[PDB]
């Protein structure tokens, strides 16, 4: 990947934003002052490996620094956002050089789960402790950490799971897994953190904040969970309740059942015999019927011209395109065999 990352430093206590660079004799470029131009040292290796495994020739990711203040020298928090990965890192200084203390990472910030299936959010983390921690530790080793999972409700935070000595809260059947990669006494430690949500319903999609609590440190990553569901498409004719045949013009109803995203659903009518041809006649779409399982339904109505003898054996079809479907879409059809006297 790239060895340099451009970025901007913002002041949270506003009421601005300065440029800066991050180097992962160096390349000079004197457009930055030695206060936002940081040369990173990642002995834990979680930060360098992220850009090493970065896709070849991918666009540059968004980034932002802030002045972190530990609470129950200086500290620079670096947040990096990209469709490839989302990362949070802590840096301590001493081009100004800095060392990476804590790093939280995820390589799937946009997980797309199918309705009714289990969702699996994955992150990892790495911690490099100062000498003060090992020197003061009776029987040294990896520190105890907390792992909390919240979902933003567009104006409200809702805690779902938390890896704990018993003060958790488990909602919607979610479970959290978290573990250091080893219990060695020294050195930086790396760990995995996963979040399992069962039988995901569309009321659970959105922003997921995953928080790592180190004794005096914080890390936060964001994920965008999206749900999709392919529709079930059917095509059947006739109209009304107790109406005589032909009283109303012949109608073709293409019904779509149980699809979630409820947008970009395009319905189309074709006639396949004599080669194919786009269907003729009046056409419109019904109103959405919202279900309880999150999904919705729709009806497309087509009034075609009378059935001519040349179209015997030919079939009418409704094709459908939707983001929860491939480029070919999904199709349903009815063949004019023993049912063409209705539409003629």
């Amino acid at each position: 990947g790239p060895a340099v990352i451009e970025c901007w430093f913002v002041e949270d206590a506003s009421g601005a934003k300065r440029p800066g660079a991050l180097l992962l004799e160096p390349p000079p470029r004197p457009d930055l002052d030695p206060e936002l131009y940081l040369s990173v040292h990642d002995p834990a290796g979680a930060l360098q490996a992220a850009f090493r495994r970065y896709p070849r020739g991918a666009p540059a990711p968004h980034c932002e620094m802030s002045r972190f203040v530990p609470l129950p020298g200086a500290w620079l928090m670096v947040s990096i956002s990209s469709p490839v990965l989302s990362l949070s890192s802590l840096l301590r200084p001493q081009i100004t050089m800095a060392t990476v203390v804590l790093t939280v990472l995820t390589h799937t910030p946009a997980p797309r789960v199918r309705l009714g299936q289990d969702a699996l959010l994955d992150l990892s983390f790495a911690y490099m402790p100062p000498t003060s921690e090992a020197a003061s530790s009776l029987a040294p080793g990896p520190p105890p950490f907390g792992l909390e999972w919240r979902r933003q409700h567009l104006g409200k935070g809702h805690l779902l799971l938390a890896a704990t000595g018993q003060m958790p809260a488990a909602q919607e059947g979610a479970v959290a897994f978290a573990a250091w990669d080893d219990d060695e006494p020294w050195g930086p430690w790396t760990g995995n953190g996963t979040f399992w949500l069962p039988r995901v319903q569309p009321f659970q999609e959105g922003t997921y904040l995953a928080t790592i609590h180190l004794p005096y440190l914080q890390g936060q990553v964001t994920l965008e969970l999206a749900v999709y569901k392919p529709p079930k498409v059917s095509l059947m004719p006739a109209t009304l309740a107790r109406a005589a045949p032909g009283e109303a013009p012949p109608e073709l109803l293409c019904l779509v059942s149980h699809f979630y995203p409820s947008g970009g659903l395009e319905v189309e009518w074709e006639l396949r015999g004599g080669r194919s041809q786009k269907a003729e006649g009046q056409r419109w779409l019904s109103a959405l019927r919202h279900h309880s399982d999150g999904s919705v339904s729709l009806s497309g109505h087509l009034q075609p011209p009378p059935v001519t003898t040349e179209q015997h054996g030919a079939r009418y079809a409704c094709r459908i395109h939707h983001p929860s479907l491939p480029a070919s879409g999904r199709s349903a059809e009815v063949t004019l065999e023993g049912g063409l006297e209705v539409l003629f």
């Epitope: 003060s132 090992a134 020197a135 003061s136 029987a139 080893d182 060695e184 006494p185 020294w186 050195g187």
Partner: antibody, heavy 120, light 107 residues
Framework: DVQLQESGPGLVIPSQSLSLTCTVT?????????WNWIRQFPGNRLEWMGY???????VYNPSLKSRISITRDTSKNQFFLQLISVTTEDTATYYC?????????????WGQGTTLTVSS | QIVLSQSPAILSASPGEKVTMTCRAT?????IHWYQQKPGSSPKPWIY???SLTSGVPVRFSGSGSGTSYSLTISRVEAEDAATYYC?????????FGGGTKLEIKR
């Protein structure tokens, strides 16, 4: 520049207590690193006994915790080893040594060694 | 208590030969450090962090390994290399050493 020097009685009567001292120059034992005690039995079998840290915290081998005591004297830049109720099996050459706080750190500085015998 | 084991008790070689000594751990360890010890002297730190040479170690020395199998390689045995080599880990509470491997030099 940085050196370690062991000292103490080369002979101890059984059932008594031995006490070795390590004197270090070119580096203070209050700044960084751990300060260890390693002994080498007859037969060249190294065994780690324990260390005192740069903050005074001590960590011992689980097989010696009931019999060992590592202290330090920051004024003379020395840390000591106290083995209680020694036996013949304690006869070995003792080294004091330094090691950092990270997994990629090695025991990067040793002493010359002090021979210790235990008998009547 | 992780136990390290060195493959040969004593490795005999001639000046100019490329010989390899190995160290196997019972459990997985992150790094393995090697020490050279001539008799009557102190064990000198020879290789730290599995593959890095200490300041002063000749470039003909090299180390490798991962998980539970590590090795030490001399690209060219020379007379001044005759000593006993120990591997050391610190992944458990008691850091342990290997039994040693005495490099005897054919002549």
């Amino acid at each position: 520049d940085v050196q370690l020097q062991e000292s103490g009685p080369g002979l101890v009567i059984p059932s008594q207590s031995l006490s070795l001292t390590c004197t270090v120059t070119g580096y203070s034992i209050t700044t960084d690193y751990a300060w260890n005690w390693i002994r080498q039995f007859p037969g060249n079998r190294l065994e780690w006994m324990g260390y005192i840290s740069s903050s005074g915290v001590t960590v011992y081998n689980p097989s010696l915790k009931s019999r060992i005591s590592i202290t330090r004297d920051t004024s003379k830049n020395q840390f000591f080893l106290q083995l209680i109720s020694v036996t013949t099996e304690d006869t070995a050459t003792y080294y004091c040594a330094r090691r950092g706080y990270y997994r990629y750190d090695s025991i990067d500085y040793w002493g010359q060694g002090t021979t210790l015998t235990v008998s009547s | 208590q992780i136990v390290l084991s060195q493959s040969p008790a004593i490795l005999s070689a001639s000046p100019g030969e490329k010989v390899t000594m190995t160290c196997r751990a019972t459990s997985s360890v992150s790094y393995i450090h090697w020490y050279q010890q001539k008799p009557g002297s102190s064990p000198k730190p020879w290789i730290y962090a599995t593959s890095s040479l200490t300041s002063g170690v000749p470039v003909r020395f090299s180390g490798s390994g991962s998980g539970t199998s590590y090795s030490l390689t001399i690209s060219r045995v020379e007379a001044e290399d005759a000593a006993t080599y120990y591997c050391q880990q610190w992944s458990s509470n008691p850091p342990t050493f290997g039994g040693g491997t005495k490099l005897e030099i054919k002549r």
